[PDB]
Design a protein around this nucleic acid. Structure first.
Ligand SMILES: [Mg+2]
Ligand SMILES: [Mg+2]
Ligand SMILES: [Mg+2]
Ligand SMILES: [Mg+2]
Ligand SMILES: [Mg+2]
Ligand SMILES: [Mg+2]
Ligand SMILES: [Mg+2]
Ligand SMILES: [Mg+2]
Ligand SMILES: [Mg+2]
Ligand SMILES: [Mg+2]
Ligand SMILES: [Mg+2]
Ligand SMILES: [Mg+2]
Ligand SMILES: [Mg+2]
Ligand SMILES: [Mg+2]
Ligand SMILES: [Mg+2]
Ligand SMILES: [Mg+2]
Ligand SMILES: [Mg+2]
Ligand SMILES: [Mg+2]
Ligand SMILES: [Mg+2]
Ligand SMILES: [Mg+2]
Ligand SMILES: [Mg+2]
Ligand SMILES: [Mg+2]
Ligand SMILES: [Mg+2]
Ligand SMILES: [Mg+2]
Ligand SMILES: [Mg+2]
Ligand SMILES: [Mg+2]
Ligand SMILES: [Mg+2]
Ligand SMILES: [Mg+2]
Ligand SMILES: [Mg+2]
Ligand SMILES: [Mg+2]
Ligand SMILES: [Mg+2]
Ligand SMILES: [Mg+2]
Ligand SMILES: [Mg+2]
Ligand SMILES: [Mg+2]
Ligand SMILES: [Mg+2]
Ligand SMILES: [Mg+2]
Ligand SMILES: [Mg+2]
Ligand SMILES: [Mg+2]
Ligand SMILES: [Mg+2]
Ligand SMILES: [Mg+2]
Ligand SMILES: [Mg+2]
Ligand SMILES: [Mg+2]
Ligand SMILES: [Mg+2]
Ligand SMILES: [Mg+2]
Ligand SMILES: [Mg+2]
Ligand SMILES: [Mg+2]
Ligand SMILES: [Mg+2]
Ligand SMILES: [Mg+2]
Ligand SMILES: [Mg+2]
Ligand SMILES: [Mg+2]
Ligand SMILES: [Mg+2]
Ligand SMILES: [Mg+2]
Ligand SMILES: [Mg+2]
Ligand SMILES: [Mg+2]
Ligand SMILES: [Mg+2]
Ligand SMILES: [Mg+2]
Ligand SMILES: [Mg+2]
Ligand SMILES: [Mg+2]
Ligand SMILES: [Mg+2]
Ligand SMILES: [Mg+2]
Ligand SMILES: [Mg+2]
Ligand SMILES: [Mg+2]
Ligand SMILES: [Mg+2]
Ligand SMILES: [Mg+2]
Ligand SMILES: [Mg+2]
Ligand SMILES: [Mg+2]
Ligand SMILES: [Mg+2]
Ligand SMILES: [Mg+2]
Ligand SMILES: [Mg+2]
Ligand SMILES: [Mg+2]
Ligand SMILES: [Mg+2]
Ligand SMILES: [Mg+2]
Ligand SMILES: [Mg+2]
Ligand SMILES: [Mg+2]
Ligand SMILES: [Mg+2]
Ligand SMILES: [Mg+2]
Ligand SMILES: [Mg+2]
Ligand SMILES: [Mg+2]
Ligand SMILES: [Mg+2]
Ligand SMILES: [Mg+2]
Ligand SMILES: [Mg+2]
Ligand SMILES: [Mg+2]
Ligand SMILES: [Mg+2]
Ligand SMILES: [Mg+2]
Ligand SMILES: [Mg+2]
Ligand SMILES: [Mg+2]
Ligand SMILES: [Mg+2]
Ligand SMILES: [Mg+2]
Ligand SMILES: [Mg+2]
Ligand SMILES: [Mg+2]
Ligand SMILES: [Mg+2]
Ligand SMILES: [Mg+2]
Ligand SMILES: [Mg+2]
Ligand SMILES: [Mg+2]
Ligand SMILES: [Mg+2]
Ligand SMILES: [Mg+2]
Ligand SMILES: [Mg+2]
Ligand SMILES: [Mg+2]
Ligand SMILES: [Mg+2]
Ligand SMILES: [Mg+2]
Ligand SMILES: [Mg+2]
Ligand SMILES: [Mg+2]
Ligand SMILES: [Mg+2]
Ligand SMILES: [Mg+2]
Ligand SMILES: [Mg+2]
Ligand SMILES: [Mg+2]
Ligand SMILES: [Mg+2]
Ligand SMILES: [Mg+2]
Ligand SMILES: [Mg+2]
Ligand SMILES: [Mg+2]
Ligand SMILES: [Mg+2]
Ligand SMILES: [Mg+2]
Ligand SMILES: [Mg+2]
Ligand SMILES: [Mg+2]
Ligand SMILES: [Mg+2]
Ligand SMILES: [Mg+2]
Ligand SMILES: [Mg+2]
Ligand SMILES: [Mg+2]
Ligand SMILES: [Mg+2]
Ligand SMILES: [Mg+2]
Ligand SMILES: [Mg+2]
Ligand SMILES: [Mg+2]
Ligand SMILES: [Mg+2]
Ligand SMILES: [Mg+2]
Ligand SMILES: [Mg+2]
Ligand SMILES: [Mg+2]
Ligand SMILES: [Mg+2]
Ligand SMILES: [Zn+2]
Lengths: 59, 140, 101, 19, 116, 112, 52
RNA sequence: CGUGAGGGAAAGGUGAAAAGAACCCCGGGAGGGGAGUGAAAUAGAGCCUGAAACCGUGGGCUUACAAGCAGUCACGGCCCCGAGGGGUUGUGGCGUGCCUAUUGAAGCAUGAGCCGGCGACUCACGGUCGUGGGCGAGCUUAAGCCGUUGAGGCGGAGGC
RNA sequence: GUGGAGCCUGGGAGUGAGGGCGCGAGCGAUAACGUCCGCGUCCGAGCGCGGGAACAACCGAGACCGCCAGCUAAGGCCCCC
RNA sequence: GGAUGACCCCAGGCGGUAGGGGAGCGUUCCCGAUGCCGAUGAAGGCCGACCCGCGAGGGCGGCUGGAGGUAAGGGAAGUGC
């Protein structure tokens, strides 16, 4: 190995073009059938403690 | 006074029978047509040439021993990927490409030249599909 | 009716009503000058050989100006040769009054 | 194939003391 | 007395950078790259001013040439006749006439055919 | 009317925070709140604070209805960097930039 | 550069440093270093001809 | 920093006056938004002015069949300002960075990441030409003395 | 023969690695983008312009600035052009 | 030509490295200055498609800035990256 190095400074354009995939994806959320709060699906609602109809955990 | 530049023109369609004509000497005329260098308001930076329809491209004629000797060539990018195809075979297999390849290489290189090549409609056999635009039979 | 006239070593198509810029002439503003005629066309078509004998074009000189400054610069690499020149070509502004036959 | 044996142009690289 | 750079160099650099608006990347943002770019620009403009006069002439000819073959002669033949006739209407106007005044152009052709 | 909040000298790196701020720009105050709550990024904590303060300013100061609020503008600016030494091999000493952010959120009223 | 207060030590070796070559920091090329052809005390007087 | 001799930095400015922002609001705080002071608060203490590289938000024009020292010349489209102009750039033409060193460099030869600031033909004395003046078989004083306190004289030793 | 000719006396220089081509020789092998002289030339300093596909020195020709005017040079006129 | 560097007329020169010569621009400081510009806004900064100049530059307008700046004509340099 002989210590590779960049040959030329990456332009403002080329680096930002690299970053055209860096956009975050917003959390996927559904309303809770009980208390109507927004939460991620297939989780136990951290607002009321309900999942699949019953109360599962203390909120 | 500034030089006249034309507002958008209606392009003219044209039908040419290639049968019997020499490959290169028809190729030349078609190119001229495509660039529209036969109209007095010719502008180099727009496509206001003609649409050229050619029939009987398979019946194009060629001097000398070029049937057996003129070799068209294709490089594939891979090692040993140079294909050599003779005129005879091309005519036999993709005849409409003969006239097309000749005409293409007489068109300019670049974005406009490429757009003009698309205004060349070449067919083997005596018929063409473009009845809709009713091309003018041209003697060239 | 239009005329092809020669002035300032160039040639221009002119017609009544035309305001026109040409190489500076030696006429006081407001005065009128008679331009040579190479050709007339429209109703009658008459062809100069090179200029037509009777014809003339009467133009009123609105005045004289200087074209927007053009920067003429010369550069020569690896030899430290750089020159910068500002150029404003003078002109005369004409009002084409009439075409005489 | 070259017959006259051709001598090394460069020495084997050796490290320097690093300032 | 001492005369530090003060205000001079910034002001010079601004001149160049202003003269470089529109350029890609550092060519419009960095004085040094701006400078280099402008050096080229000046030479091209000078060169192209010269060559513009050629670009338009070639255009005129091509247009004249096409308008002649509508009358059964070519550019070179047309110009000779035009010469033998003693008609001095330049190409800038020939080509204008070819487009805007075909009758006038048609007259001109006849005279040129006759003059040969 | 607009309301605005700014968090300055927040010790987080602008590139990282901006990623989050991007998620809520032009969004309702209501959706923004939902988004930040389940955004698995450290920045989400900070951006949430600025969001709320602006809404607070909107309601409490500038006579705007909490229900009509949305994120009209939002942007992260670079603040001063805490330059730090990172010791490396063979005696070399690198410099680390603990970057710092200026988070700005600006709220407006959706008259529709 | 000899009237300036720094020592005459060569700041780092001539070669193999990866950096430009230098001597002492009193060099006029350095910020803080000596000045080159700067003013010294001077007598601006001369003897204009008495007749003049 | 160095065992030591020794080396040896960086770092100035709110405002006329602290009148240095009570109190309220979000926040754990930091920070902000109102209120208040001020002629001025993007003069708010991370404080005069506040350039540039660099980063970001909004907007106009533009770009996913196209070949490049990035420009330049022409034309067209769109946007903006009031037979005109500014911005942008689609197509066409042309087009081998800058500096250095060289017989010859775009050169695959040197140097430069980019920006800002520092950075290199001076001075004393003597010489030699040219030159602006004064005087001219002559020209001129040096140290010093006197005077002035930004006043100029005297001094002929000596020099050519 | 009045020319950015010439001669004279002075002040300031740079230069004292040249290179290609044609011709004349030597060296070399009737080799070298070879080497060394002589005459000339161009590049050097005209890597400004047209031609030679491209290309310092081959051909054409010595760019003060402007023009969307005209005539030529070499070279070209089937299409790219 | 006029009467002397006023401007007009005609004719010719005007590629350029090392280098010689000429004419200018800008920077800091001095005389001009016990003056003059300046809160009705100094210097500096951001703009300008405007005006002058071959150009280096100089004006002028808008914005910022908030206390300095400095003429015609001369003088001296830590004078232009
Ligand atoms: Mg290993
Ligand atoms: Mg960019
Ligand atoms: Mg960007
Ligand atoms: Mg990239
Ligand atoms: Mg045919
Ligand atoms: Mg081409
Ligand atoms: Mg003109
Ligand atoms: Mg003129
Ligand atoms: Mg160069
Ligand atoms: Mg070059
Ligand atoms: Mg050279
Ligand atoms: Mg300096
Ligand atoms: Mg710019
Ligand atoms: Mg660039
Ligand atoms: Mg130039
Ligand atoms: Mg130029
Ligand atoms: Mg020409
Ligand atoms: Mg002729
Ligand atoms: Mg003619
Ligand atoms: Mg028409
Ligand atoms: Mg997530
Ligand atoms: Mg609230
Ligand atoms: Mg480690
Ligand atoms: Mg480590
Ligand atoms: Mg260690
Ligand atoms: Mg770093
Ligand atoms: Mg980094
Ligand atoms: Mg930071
Ligand atoms: Mg010392
Ligand atoms: Mg010392
Ligand atoms: Mg000391
Ligand atoms: Mg020593
Ligand atoms: Mg070294
Ligand atoms: Mg290095
Ligand atoms: Mg010092
Ligand atoms: Mg010195
Ligand atoms: Mg020194
Ligand atoms: Mg000294
Ligand atoms: Mg001094
Ligand atoms: Mg001195
Ligand atoms: Mg002296
Ligand atoms: Mg110690
Ligand atoms: Mg203060
Ligand atoms: Mg104070
Ligand atoms: Mg507060
Ligand atoms: Mg607080
Ligand atoms: Mg007040
Ligand atoms: Mg108040
Ligand atoms: Mg006031
Ligand atoms: Mg405030
Ligand atoms: Mg301000
Ligand atoms: Mg202030
Ligand atoms: Mg600061
Ligand atoms: Mg102050
Ligand atoms: Mg400030
Ligand atoms: Mg600031
Ligand atoms: Mg953007
Ligand atoms: Mg394709
Ligand atoms: Mg496309
Ligand atoms: Mg492309
Ligand atoms: Mg290219
Ligand atoms: Mg065109
Ligand atoms: Mg345009
Ligand atoms: Mg182009
Ligand atoms: Mg340069
Ligand atoms: Mg070298
Ligand atoms: Mg290259
Ligand atoms: Mg290069
Ligand atoms: Mg390279
Ligand atoms: Mg090397
Ligand atoms: Mg290189
Ligand atoms: Mg070397
Ligand atoms: Mg170098
Ligand atoms: Mg390097
Ligand atoms: Mg480095
Ligand atoms: Mg940079
Ligand atoms: Mg000297
Ligand atoms: Mg002397
Ligand atoms: Mg003397
Ligand atoms: Mg005397
Ligand atoms: Mg005496
Ligand atoms: Mg005394
Ligand atoms: Mg001479
Ligand atoms: Mg001579
Ligand atoms: Mg000298
Ligand atoms: Mg020698
Ligand atoms: Mg020789
Ligand atoms: Mg020799
Ligand atoms: Mg040789
Ligand atoms: Mg021969
Ligand atoms: Mg030989
Ligand atoms: Mg022989
Ligand atoms: Mg031989
Ligand atoms: Mg030989
Ligand atoms: Mg020779
Ligand atoms: Mg040389
Ligand atoms: Mg020569
Ligand atoms: Mg060349
Ligand atoms: Mg080359
Ligand atoms: Mg040139
Ligand atoms: Mg060529
Ligand atoms: Mg060549
Ligand atoms: Mg060669
Ligand atoms: Mg050449
Ligand atoms: Mg001719
Ligand atoms: Mg010929
Ligand atoms: Mg040819
Ligand atoms: Mg042709
Ligand atoms: Mg004259
Ligand atoms: Mg002349
Ligand atoms: Mg000449
Ligand atoms: Mg010259
Ligand atoms: Mg000043
Ligand atoms: Mg005073
Ligand atoms: Mg004074
Ligand atoms: Mg004063
Ligand atoms: Mg006043
Ligand atoms: Mg006031
Ligand atoms: Mg003001
Ligand atoms: Mg000052
Ligand atoms: Mg100015
Ligand atoms: Mg101002
Ligand atoms: Mg004061
Ligand atoms: Mg003065
Ligand atoms: Mg005086
Ligand atoms: Mg100096
Ligand atoms: Mg610098
Ligand atoms: Zn729930």
């Amino acid at each position: 190995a002989k210590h590779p190095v960049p040959k030329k400074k990456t332009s403002k354009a080329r680096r930002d073009a690299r970053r055209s995939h860096h956009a975050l994806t917003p959390p996927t959320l559904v309303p809770c059938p009980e208390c109507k709060a927004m939460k991620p699906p297939h989780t136990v609602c951290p607002e009321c403690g309900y999942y699949a109809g019953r109360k599962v955990l203390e909120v | 006074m500034k030089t006249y530049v034309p507002k958008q023109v209606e392009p003219r369609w044209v039908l040419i029978d290639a049968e019997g004509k020499t490959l290169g000497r028809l190729a030349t005329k078609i190119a001229t047509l495509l660039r529209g260098k036969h109209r007095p308001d010719w502008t180099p930076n727009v496509a206001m040439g003609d649409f050229v329809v050619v029939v009987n491209a398979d019946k194009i004629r060629v001097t000398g021993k070029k049937l057996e000797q003129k070799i068209y060539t294709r490089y594939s990018g891979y090692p040993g990927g140079l294909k050599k195809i003779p005129l005879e075979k091309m005519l036999a297999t993709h005849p409409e490409r003969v006239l097309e390849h000749a005409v293409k290489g007489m068109l300019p290189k670049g974005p406009l030249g490429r757009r003009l090549f698309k205004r060349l409609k070449v067919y083997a056999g005596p018929d063409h599909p473009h009845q809709a635009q009713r091309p003018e039979k041209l003697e060239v | 009716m239009f005329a092809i006239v020669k002035t300032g070593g160039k040639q221009y198509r002119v017609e009544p009503g035309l305001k026109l810029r040409v190489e500076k002439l030696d006429a006081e503003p407001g005065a009128t000058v008679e331009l040579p005629v190479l050709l007339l066309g429209g109703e009658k078509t008459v062809v100069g050989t090179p200029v037509v004998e009777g014809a003339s074009v009467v133009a009123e000189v609105l005045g004289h100006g200087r074209g927007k400054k053009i920067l003429v610069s010369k550069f020569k690499a690896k030899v430290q040769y750089r020159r910068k020149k500002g150029h404003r070509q003078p002109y005369t502004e004409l009002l084409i009054k009439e075409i005489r036959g | 194939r070259r017959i006259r044996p051709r001598p090394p142009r460069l020495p084997r690289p050796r490290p320097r003391p690093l300032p | 007395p001492r005369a530090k750079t003060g205000v001079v160099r910034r002001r010079k650099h601004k001149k160049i950078l202003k003269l470089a608006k529109g350029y890609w990347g550092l060519r419009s943002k960095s004085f040094r790259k701006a400078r280099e770019t402008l050096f080229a620009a000046g030479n091209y403009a000078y060169a192209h001013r010269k060559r513009r006069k050629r670009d338009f002439r070639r255009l005129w000819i091509v247009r004249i040439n096409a308008a002649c073959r509508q009358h059964g002669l070519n550019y070179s033949t047309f110009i000779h006749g035009l010469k033998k006739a003693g008609i001095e209407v330049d190409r800038k106007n020939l080509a204008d006439l070819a487009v805007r005044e075909p009758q006038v152009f048609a007259e001109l052709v006849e005279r040129a055919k006759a003059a040969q | 009317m607009e309301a605005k909040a700014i968090a300055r000298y927040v010790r987080i790196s602008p590139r990282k925070v901006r990623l989050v701020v991007d998620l809520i720009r032009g969004k309702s105050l209501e959706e923004a709140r939902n988004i930040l709550r389940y955004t698995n990024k450290r920045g989400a904590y900070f951006v949430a604070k600025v969001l709320e303060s602006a809404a607070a300013n909107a309601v409490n100061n500038h006579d705007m209805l909490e229900d009509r609020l949305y994120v009209k503008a939002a942007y992260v600016d670079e603040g001063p960097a805490l330059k730090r030494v990172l010791p490396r091999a063979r005696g070399r000493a690198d410099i680390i930039k603990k970057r710092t952010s200026h988070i700005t959120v600006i709220l407006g009223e959706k008259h529709g | 550069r000899g009237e300036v207060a720094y020592s005459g030590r060569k700041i780092w070796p001539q070669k193999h440093t990866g950096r430009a070559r230098h001597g002492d920091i009193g060099a006029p090329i350095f910020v803080g270093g000596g000045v080159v052809f700067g003013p010294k005390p001077r007598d601006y007087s001369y003897t204009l001809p008495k007749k003049v």
